[PDB]
């Protein structure tokens, strides 16, 4: 029924304040609208707004914050064929943070801690080449602008680390599966080995480059909310200062075991 | 108990009801709904399609704690009363008053015990009496649901999400508004917003609101510890008379 442009008009109407979320009254207004569409004969009541809201939010509030962001509305009302946003989801889920950091380090090429309009443009260009589509330069500028407006939450014209994470549907923190109860020397060894094996994607017995980055992001996010690009470089340097004893810029298994106890 | 049901079926404690845990979960459901009915593979598969279409919001064919919570807890009128006020929470100073009151040990984090105190007071504000076991249950449920990194603590952005804090106040101001008259109107609108006690200084949760909102212009949602760090940083560089308050003159000086 609905197409990309008309989906946008509905998104723009209900994200009244253009802050990237259908939240509070925007969301009640959205679900009031929905009741009239589905049941025109029926009178809108607070009980029925709350019933249709529960129903749809349980199916489509994938981030569990009680708000709708553009992808969650797209899942609700936009047929897959017209979902331009589905360009960023592959056949394989992105569940290794090292593979994410390789993309972050490629496109944040200067390691400024942010992806600029120009850097995002390079990312979209390569993404179109991966789908063997050729996009004319003016259309590429258009797409870049649209994407920046959609995903730039604090409106500084830049994507942070957690903005690219959201765009690429980065999965959960690998380290959250490990348990405090696993207290036995044998269990501690099995977990250390499983952990190092996961980040050591090149299987060289050291964490190098985006392998360090994945480990630092995941480790820091055990104790604090999603970290920034700048924070990643700060805590990375902090881990190297305290654990890279041979100063080779790599974290050898022995160095990490030492630093942890 | 919601937690006991979660713990039973997430047998291997990996954060997901998946594979056989999920078929076992939906076998258990059939017996609850229709005790007289015999479990068959067709009926497990039919109830699974049905419930996963309604509740698998992440579309991964697994249940995580929030998806199970949606399935059982919003059926409880008193649990839903936790998430209802008439007025939107769109002033971060009002949010910080709640943060500072209930972070009672000033750890920069809300513990299970502190969250229990918050829910108790919330029920008193709605003149509802909740049985003690239901209060414990709601506290444990909330901890497990909203503790995203599983350290047994709620951070600042977790409480923000629980209270539906709206955070667009500084994002309304525009780079275009370059005229000395416009800069004054915006500065005054900004100070007036955080200066909730109308004393011409930012005191206590007024400084907190301003620091959270200002820091979140350039970085993702900040932590409780981050708040105390940047708060002391703002005082070190702007509190010229060293009274622990940010007078309008001090902030105008620090900004330009």
């Amino acid at each position: 029924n609905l197409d990309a442009a008309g989906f946008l008009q509905i998104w723009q109407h209900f994200d009244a304040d253009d802050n990237g979320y259908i939240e509070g009254k925007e969301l009640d207004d959205f679900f009031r609208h929905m009741l009239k569409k589905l049941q025109p004969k029926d009178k809108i009541t607070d009980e029925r707004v709350q019933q249709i809201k529960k129903s749809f939010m349980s199916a489509y509030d994938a981030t569990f914050d009680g708000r709708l962001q553009i992808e969650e509305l797209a899942n609700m009302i936009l047929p897959q064929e017209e979902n331009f946003l589905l360009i960023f989801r592959r056949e394989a889920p992105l569940d290794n943070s090292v593979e994410f950091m390789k993309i972050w380090r490629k496109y944040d090429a200067d390691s400024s801690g942010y992806i600029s309009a120009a850097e995002l443009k390079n990312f979209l260009k390569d993404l179109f080449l991966q789908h063997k589509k050729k996009i004319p330069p003016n259309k590429l500028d258009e797409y870049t602008d649209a994407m920046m407006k959609i995903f730039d939450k604090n409106k500084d014209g830049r994507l942070d680390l957690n903005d690219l994470a959201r765009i690429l549907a980065l999965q959960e923190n690998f380290l959250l599966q490990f348990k405090m109860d696993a207290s036995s020397q044998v269990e501690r060894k099995r977990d250390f080995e499983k952990i190092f094996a996961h980040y050591d994607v090149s299987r060289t017995g050291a964490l190098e480059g985006p392998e360090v980055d994945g480990f630092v992001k995941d480790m820091m996010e055990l104790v604090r909310p999603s970290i920034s690009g700048g924070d990643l470089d700060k805590f990375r340097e902090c881990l190297l200062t305290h654990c890279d004893m041979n100063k080779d810029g790599k974290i050898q298994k022995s160095e990490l075991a030492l630093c942890l106890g | 108990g919601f937690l006991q049901i979660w713990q039973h079926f997430d047998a291997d404690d990996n954060g997901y009801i998946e594979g056989k845990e999920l078929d076992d979960f939906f076998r258990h459901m059939l017996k609850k709904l229709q005790p007289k009915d015999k479990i068959t593979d067709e009926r497990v598969q039919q109830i699974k399609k049905s419930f996963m279409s309604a509740y698998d919001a992440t579309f991964d064919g697994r249940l995580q704690i929030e998806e199970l919570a949606n399935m059982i807890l919003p059926q409880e009128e008193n649990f839903l009363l936790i998430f209802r006020r008439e007025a939107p929470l769109d002033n971060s100073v009002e949010f910080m008053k709640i943060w500072r009151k209930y972070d009672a040990d000033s750890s920069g984090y809300i513990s299970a015990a502190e969250l229990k105190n918050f829910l108790k007071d919330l029920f008193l504000q709605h003149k509802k009496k909740i049985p003690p076991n239901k209060l414990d249950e709601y506290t444990d449920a909330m901890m497990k649901i909203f503790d995203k990194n599983k350290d047994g603590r709620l951070d600042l952005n977790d409480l923000a999400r629980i209270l539906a804090l709206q955070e667009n106040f500084l994002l309304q101001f525009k780079m275009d508004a370059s005229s000395q008259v416009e800069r004054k109107r915006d500065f005054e609108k900004i100070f007036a917003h955080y200066d909730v006690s109308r004393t011409g200084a930012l005191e206590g949760p007024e400084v907190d609101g301003f620091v959270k909102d200002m820091m979140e212009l350039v970085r993702p949602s900040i932590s409780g510890g981050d708040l105390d760090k940047f708060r002391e940083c703002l005082l070190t560089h702007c509190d010229m008379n060293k009274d622990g308050k940010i007078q309008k003159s001090e902030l105008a000086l620090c900004l330009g």
Partner: peptide
């Protein structure tokens, strides 16, 4: 040079200290 520019700059400076 709107007043939001000064806020952003102060935030960036404090976030780099």
């Amino acid at each position: 040079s709107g007043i939001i520019g000064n806020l952003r700059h102060m935030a960036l400076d404090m976030g780099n200290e």
